[PDB]
DNA sequence: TTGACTCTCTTAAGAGAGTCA
DNA sequence: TTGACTCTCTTAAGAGAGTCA
């Protein structure tokens, strides 16, 4: 098994490589009618992506290192959390993009939480609009708002009460 | 089936059958420290379920009627909305349960919206805690709250800024 | 040891369609 | 015509593992 030192070395190699990705400045809603700025470190759209990186899906990548003749591989966003517990409350931990930008690999834009917590950030009003997440959101979620509901609750007869 | 009169016939027969389901009272959080009461009309746990109804999955059912000697079938929760557009902004319309109770078929607890809008109601603060859904929620979402994040954003070196 | 491809799987909100009696 | 079962698929947030040179 990899030692703590080997794991830290893996995290260091990842940061050095991701830190050289193109840095894109984005203006984003924060909630409460305010605007902020996020700086995303974005993996390239096509190969080559960077030392150790390869694409396994349309917006999925993996990071690979060979140690003592053995090949090790991790999801490209999971590396910052290799020294953390990998489950909580019986649920698997997942890399959760606070910037909602799948190509970004900035570890300051990622957290480590259940898939339900991860998903729910899509609808959060944001750090200046009422976010109650203990690890606070960086921006208002892209899907927050009144929605586009086609038809509401309704009945034709009188069989039902609310 | 095809004509307006036949579709109205399907909706009326469905309302009559579901109107005989057992009515179960559920007390629910509304947000803002307040509580309300909903009356769900719950499909039985095992067969028989009711005229026209059959189970295709653990929490999935279908309604079936024979019209013009042909069998027509729909998802158990879609029948109230058979006269509505079946898409919006190029996204499929889905039956969304405002009471978050899958066995419930009370049409006063259903709406018709994209799968993203549907999912997002799981994290809404509720009608007394700040819901902004244009078709308003009936309760606070079951997954609303601070979350259980294991690790927050972090870096080991000095290569990244927020 | 490394790059650039290939394939299938998980979750929880939702679906369509076939086999028998 | 009606009832009671069987199977796989969709979406968008996430994953693991094989092949070849
Ligand atoms: Na996310
Ligand atoms: Na729902
Ligand atoms: Zn980012
Ligand atoms: Zn938040
Ligand atoms: Zn209900
Ligand atoms: Zn709401």
Author numbering:
A (entry chain A): 2 to 163
B (entry chain B): 202 to 363
What does the paper say about this structure?
Because His98 has been proposed to primarily activate the nucleophilic water, we first mutated His98 to alanine. To confirm divalent metal ion binding, the H98A I-PpoI crystals were soaked for 1800s in 500 µM Mn2+, the same concentration used to initiate DNA hydrolysis by WT I-PpoI. However, to our surprise, the metal ion-binding site was devoid of any anomalous signal. Increasing the Mn2+ concentration to 1 mM still did not produce anomalous density at the Me2+-binding site. (D) Structure of H98A I-PpoI active site after 1 mM Mn2+ soaking for 1800s. The results indicate that metal ion binding can be altered by perturbing His98 and possibly water deprotonation, even though the metal ion-binding site and His98 exist 7 Å apart without direct interaction. Moreover, the metal ion was not observed in crystallo when His98 was removed. Without a proper proton acceptor, the metal ion may be prone for dissociation without the reaction proceeding, and thus stable Mg2+ binding was not observed in crystallo without His98. Our results indicate that perturbing the deprotonation pathway not only affects nucleophilic attack but also metal binding, suggesting that I-PpoI catalyzes DNA catalysis via a concerted mechanism.
